[PDB]
């Protein structure tokens, strides 16, 4: 970025007298890309936006602008706070424009305010407004505000000539101003940056730079597709790269080309490419590519094949016909035909997935921006329960929860606009029970996700982290090390000992301060492809480690699987794909594959063949330090008070495994929840926070014995280890 | 639960003609005696019946007609509303067609036999389609309004003449007109029952509410089950409760 993010400006007094006129300097117009008629859209506090147009000033200072007191009164701000500006390049003309004046205003006046106030008012002035400016109109030796109410084209436009301006009785009030309906933008979209960002290089150097892709020669995203669960906001990323942009969208789908009839299938369908023809800045956007061309065994008709025939003669030859670019709706990259999957058109395949923990608040932030909640709710451990949802089911999760708290309260009086607004109101148990009554649709899906340990849960191993360190993070760091001497680096390490959970963790904090994604490959999800003898699952699952460069690929107990056999064996129908991908693995990208198993003498040799599974990590028992940092993160994100003995703990209890000492720590929580509910019992029969598991229950916790390691088995892991002790 | 809404007299008669006055209520309300007075049942049924005929009942009580009783409701002792619209056009001879009990007995002139004799200037304003029984002897004879020239709720003339060309259908058609529509009617399972009850009733009545959550979650409801549970009874049950067009396919 820049310095104090230039866009921020100081608030100051202007001197013209208009109301949507704002003045700033030579050079910072030359620099924020301004003309000296062009619209920009201001933003302030209180989530308030403004549309006005940007005039050379000469009195003006380098890092203030001058404005009036409506503008100031609009963004609700006072002289010395801060403000921004955002350029608005793409602004239309409005069609139909409500306005009603403030009660206080009018009293005393009757008669048409159309031709005495509003008609000299926009008289070929073309002033920008939003929804929700109150701007002041001069007129009969008094003056009088008047308020936007709703406009077609409904977040912003310009006053046009042949714009129908309704000015009609009763009007309504000053009140909260609540947002109802708007038009979706880069805003809109919720969390997809990683990827938003590419769409947005690839569809911004089409806009207004021609001899540009003649200097390149080829134009390079000539096909986008855009894979991943229904309804991501594909339509609304579609929607959102067209108004922003200034193109024509002409969106079709699938269904719709075949709405028609043998013989009509060609109409409608060309003939949008040719509307495509004679709009040259335009986009083409196709919903539900699957019901349009399927795999070619899937293709069980005739006309469907036609179609896909024209889609493909449609789609070669348009190389240089009036610069459009086309883009695509599917489910996954295989679903469709893998013969329009080629290149010189539909190259520029992009995932979207699902979005993470902070994807999901800010989306939920958006849809919970327009409608005033209870303003208790945090709305972040909301959608942090939240777990394979996509953001059409978080709508619906919001929708649900409006209409429970509408259901919440009684019939009120039937249809003035202010009674079911300002009484809104959503609680916890709210959104909880909507929690409940929500079902979701990305469960079941690989999730891709950075998620958060922030290396402090890891205990020991000092050395091995730093081990691990230098084989994934610094080569995302300091490439040019590993380029000077050319050494390839090890990609693939193994992990063997107690069944231990650490591992996850440590992959999960390579994820984190590599900052890179992660997939969860399960054992139960290997005995799933093995069983079900699709032996063809670990290629897209790959394709999207391809994809989401960088990233961790934990995979499970690969032994489980040879575990099934043991008559005897080597390698399975699951186990020699990924020995495929392996030497398919290219040494770039950064992405790493990580192993994690229990017992190596009942894996594949081929594993143990260097360059395919390089290096053997053992994973110990835990030591106190590590004890005490499980302790911690027993601690974590827990409410627990003071007099707590962590030491109290490793002292005897090193024979056991980690987990248990984790459920030590949950069997005391429930023994706290079942005692704190009979004291609620307790003042039930009669008729203090108590925050602390006091350390009684902590010695019952940990009096009954777990232990889930052998020690045969770990004089076996110390002979593995003495085995590569070299 | 509205003031509106008060508990109903005893049918102390069968006829559509006769509305007894409730004083008291009459000292509450602004109802204006002569023509028409506006009343609801329940499910979205508007009918329109005189007022000022009989004065039997007593205070917050209003004896009403047998057929807003047997019909325009799910059963007897329940609430009846009132509304104020007089000075409305007149008609001109509706509902000439019977449909049940002209096989027995003579056909006669078809409304110069049971319906001039009975009524006392109150000529019949109630919806086109809907019934009302009426005979000398044996008091249950209906008909249905098939001539439709007045088209909001219109008096007629007394001792007007149209065609008498209309012909007997059925006698079930009454009861298939509503095709047992009720909530006590349908069996229910009464979760889910509860769960679409709500989610249809919140679009019901209240288009406007839809502005106030901006978000519309009814937009298709998938109906799981097996066959034999009354699924195409369920949504004719959620229908005419609330009050539209059913029309299926
Ligand atoms: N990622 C998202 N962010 C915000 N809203 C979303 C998102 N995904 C879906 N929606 C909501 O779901 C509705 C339909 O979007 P979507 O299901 O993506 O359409 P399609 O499936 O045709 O692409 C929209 O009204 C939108 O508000
Ligand atoms: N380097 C390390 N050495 C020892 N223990 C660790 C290390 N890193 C993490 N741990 C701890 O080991 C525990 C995982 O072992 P455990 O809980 O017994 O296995 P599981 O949950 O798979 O049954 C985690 O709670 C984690 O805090
Ligand atoms: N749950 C129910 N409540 C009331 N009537 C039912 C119910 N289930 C079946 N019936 C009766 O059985 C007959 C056939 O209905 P049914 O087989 O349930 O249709 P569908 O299976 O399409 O819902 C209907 O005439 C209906 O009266």
New binding site residues.
């Given amino acids: 970025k820049q310095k104090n993010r230039p866009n921020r400006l100081i608030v100051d007094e202007a001197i013209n007298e208009d109301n949507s006129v704002v003045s700033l300097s030579q050079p910072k117009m030359d620099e924020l890309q301004l003309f000296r008629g062009d619209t920009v859209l201001l933003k302030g506090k209180k989530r308030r936006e403004a549309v006005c147009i940007v005039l050379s000033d000469d009195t003006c200072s380098d890092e203030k602008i001058r404005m009036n007191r409506v503008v100031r009164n609009n963004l609700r701000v006072r002289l010395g706070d801060v403000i921004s500006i955002q350029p608005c390049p793409d602004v239309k003309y409005g069609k139909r424009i409500h306005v009603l004046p403030i009660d206080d205003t009018v009293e005393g006046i009757t008669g048409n305010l159309f031709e005495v106030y509003l008609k000299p008012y926009f008289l070929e002035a073309y002033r920008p407004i939003r929804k929700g400016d109150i701007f002041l109109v001069h007129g009969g030796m008094r003056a009088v505000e008047f308020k936007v109410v709703e406009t077609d084209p409904s977040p912003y436009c310009i006053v046009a000539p042949d714009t129908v301006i309704h000015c009609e009785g009763e009007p309504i009030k000053r009140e909260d101003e609540e947002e109802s309906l708007n038009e979706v933008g880069y805003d809109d979209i919720g969390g997809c940056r990683k990827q938003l960002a590419q769409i947005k290089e690839m569809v911004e150097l089409p806009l207004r730079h021609p001899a540009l892709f003649k200097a390149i020669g080829v134009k390079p995203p000539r096909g986008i597709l855009l894979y991943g669960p229904p309804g991501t906001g594909k339509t609304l990323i579609a929607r959102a790269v067209a108004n922003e942009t200034g193109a024509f969208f002409f969106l079709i789908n699938g269904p719709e080309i075949m709405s028609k009839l043998a013989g009509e299938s060609e109409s409608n369908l060309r003939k949008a490419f040719e509307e495509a023809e004679k709009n040259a800045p335009a986009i083409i956007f196709i919903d539900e590519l699957d019901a349009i061309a399927p795999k070619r065994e899937k293709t069980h008709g005739e006309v469907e094949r036609r179609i896909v025939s024209q889609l493909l003669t449609l789609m070669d030859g348009l190389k240089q016909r009036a610069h459009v670019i086309v883009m695509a709706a599917t489910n996954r990259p295989n679903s469709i035909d893998p013969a329009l999957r080629r290149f010189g058109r539909f190259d520029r395949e992009v995932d979207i997935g699902i979005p993470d923990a902070t994807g999901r608040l800010e989306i939920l932030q958006i849809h919970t921006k327009n409608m005033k909640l209870a303003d208790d709710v945090d709305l972040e451990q909301v959608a942090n329960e939240t777990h394979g949802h996509v953001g059409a089911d978080l709508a619906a999760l919001c929708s649900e929860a409006a209409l429970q708290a509408i259901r919440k309260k009684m019939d009120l009086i039937d249809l003035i606009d202010a009674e079911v607004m300002n009484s809104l109101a959503v609680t916890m148990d709210d959104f909880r029970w909507a929690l409940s009554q929500s079902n979701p649709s990305a469960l079941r899906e690989t999730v891709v996700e950075v998620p958060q340990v922030t290396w402090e ?5 000092e050395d ?2 730093r081990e691990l360190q230098e084989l994934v993070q610094y080569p995302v760091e300091h490439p040019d090390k590993f380029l000077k001497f050319g050494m390839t680096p090890s990609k693939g390490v193994l992990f063997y000992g ?5 591992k ?3 992959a999960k904090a390579i994820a984190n301060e590599c900052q890179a994604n992660f997939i969860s490959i399960k054992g139960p999800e290997l005995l799933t492809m093995w069983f079900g003898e699709s032996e063809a699952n670990v290629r897209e699952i790959f394709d999207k480690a391809r994809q989401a460069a960088p990233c961790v690929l934990f995979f499970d107990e690969l032994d489980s699987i040879a575990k099934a056999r043991g008559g005897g064996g080597a390698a399975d129908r699951v186990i020699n794909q990924i020995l495929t991908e392996m030497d398919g693995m290219s040494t770039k990208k950064n992405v790493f594959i990580i192993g994690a198993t229990n017992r190596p003498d009942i894996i594949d040799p081929a594993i143990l063949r260097p360059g395919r599974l390089d290096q053997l990590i053992y ?5 106190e330090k ?1 004890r005490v ?2 302790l911690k ?1 027993n601690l974590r994100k827990s409410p627990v008070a003071k007099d707590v003995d962590l030491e109290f703990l490793a002292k005897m209890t090193n024979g056991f ?6 459920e030590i720590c949950q069997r005391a929580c429930k023994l706290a929840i079942r005692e704190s509910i009979e004291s609620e019992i307790r003042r039930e029969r009669e008729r203090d926070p108590v925050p602390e598991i006091r350390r009684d229950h902590f010695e019952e916790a940990m009096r009954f014995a777990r232990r ?1 390691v052998s020690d045969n088995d770990i004089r076996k892991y110390e002979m593995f280890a003495q085995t590569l002790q070299q």
């Fill in positions: 849960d890891i205990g020991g191993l091995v982290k107690p069944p231990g959970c650490g996850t963790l440590l994973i110990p028992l835990p030591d590590s940092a499980i993160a495994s980690g987990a248990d000492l984790t889930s």
